Amino acid sequence: STYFDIRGVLDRGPTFKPYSGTAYNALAPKGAPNSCEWEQNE
Amino acid sequence: QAVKTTAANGDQGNTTWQKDSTFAERNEIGVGNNFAMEINLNANLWRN
């Protein structure tokens, strides 16, 4: 019957990623940029 | 190509000089929905 009980806090770290693939514009074309503008010479 | 509001005395919103002094002259801009090619998937797989 006997067993220990432990409660506490943990931080998994900044190198955690539980899922495969990606979760931001999943169907976005692998190279397509977005609306942007950039500088250039004369 | 691009522009800028003129002296704006009245009804001069489209009345415009050439702002491209700061920009290019043939900047690329798209219109409307992008090109697309639909293809159904599951039924094709089941048929295969």
From TrEMBL, chain B:
Query: What domain of life does the UniProt record list for this protein's source?
Result: Viruses
Q: What induces it?
A: Expressed in the late phase of the viral replicative cycle.
- Quote the subcellular location field of this record: Host nucleus; Virion
Q: Which family does it belong to?
A: Belongs to the adenoviridae hexon protein family.
Additional observations:
All late proteins expressed from the major late promoter are produced by alternative splicing and alternative polyadenylation of the same gene giving rise to non-overlapping ORFs. A leader sequence is present in the N-terminus of all these mRNAs and is recognized by the viral shutoff protein to provide expression although conventional translation via ribosome scanning from the cap has been shut off in the host cell.
What's the stated role of this polypeptide? Major capsid protein that self-associates to form 240 hexon trimers, each in the shape of a hexagon, building most of the pseudo T=25 capsid. Assembled into trimeric units with the help of the chaperone shutoff protein. Transported by pre-protein VI to the nucleus where it associates with other structural proteins to form an empty capsid. Might be involved, through its interaction with host dyneins, in the intracellular microtubule-dependent transport of incoming viral capsid to the nucleus.
What quaternary structure, including any partners, is listed in this protein's UniProt entry? Homotrimer. Interacts with the capsid vertex protein; this interaction binds the peripentonal hexons to the neighboring penton base. Interacts with the hexon-linking protein; this interaction tethers the hexons surrounding the penton to those situated in the central plate of the facet. Interacts with the hexon-interlacing protein; this interaction lashes the hexons together. Interacts with host dyneins DYNC1LI1 and DYNC1I2; this interaction might be involved in intracellular microtubule-dependent transport of incoming viral capsid.
Q: What is this protein called?
A: Hexon protein
Q: Which organism is it from?
A: Human adenovirus C serotype 6
Q: Which gene encodes it?
A: Hexon
Q: Which residues of the full protein are shown?
A: 435 to 482 of 963
